[PDB]
Amino acid sequence: QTVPLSRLFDHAMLQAHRAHQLAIDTYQEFEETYIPKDQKYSFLSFCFSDSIPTSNLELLRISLLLIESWLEPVRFLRSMFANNLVYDTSDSDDYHLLKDLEEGIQTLMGRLEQILKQTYSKFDTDALLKNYGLLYCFRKDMDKVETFLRMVQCRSVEGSC
Predict the structure, then answer these.
(1) Which class for 31: exposed (0-12), middle (13-18), buried (19 or more C-beta within 10 A)?
(2) d(C-alpha 49, C-alpha 148), whole Å
(3) What are the disulphide bonds in this sequence?
(4) Is 17 labelled a binding residue?
(5) Contact criterion met (CB below 8 Å) for 108 and 8
(6) Residue 77 to residues 32, 85, 151: CA-CA distances in angstroms?
(7) How far apart are CA 66 and CA 102, in angstroms?
(8) Contact 136, 47 (CB under 8 A)
(9) Is 146 within any annotated ligand binding site?
(10) Which domains does the chain have, with CATH numbers?
């Protein structure tokens, strides 16, 4: 057996949905815990996803870039949820889920047959407001990924949508 394209899209869409939920859940939990009323949305500081607006190996290509920009910051997500805690390198969060998604996208690309590098700062132990902005962009980027993958799925797998 060879994996149908649909299963491949179904796997990638579930993992994008899950990365996107992770981003939403983390942002919310941060905001509720650390951001007072008077500072809500203070971040408003452009996200990777604000670069390219709105079928293609291209859409898949951007998705891939978006995920890649987060693969390293992501292990540090829970480090902000303590007081003076630095991530101890213990199992590559359950959040290298992005590595799963990454490879799932690179698999979809080789089925469907770069001058500027865009990398995110690392999360911190100002710092609060940076971490806030970073969580905002992780959420915006993951929404974009899920979006661009759906567009591709629909056009590539008939009846999908």
Answers:
(1) middle
(2) 11
(3) 47-137, 154-161
(4) yes
(5) yes
(6) 15, 11, 28
(7) 10
(8) yes
(9) yes
(10) 1-161 (1.20.1250.10)
| Alpha carbon separation from 156 to 4, 66, 76, 111, 149 (Å, rounded) | 12, 21, 35, 11, 10
Nearest to 66 by CA among 130, 122, 9, 142: 142
Identify residue 52 by its one-letter amino acid code.
I
CB of 148 within 8 A of CB of 63?
A: yes
User: How long a stretch of residues is the chain?
Assistant: 161
- Quote the tokens at residue 128: 């609060």
Q: How far apart are CA 129 and CA 111, in angstroms?
A: 41
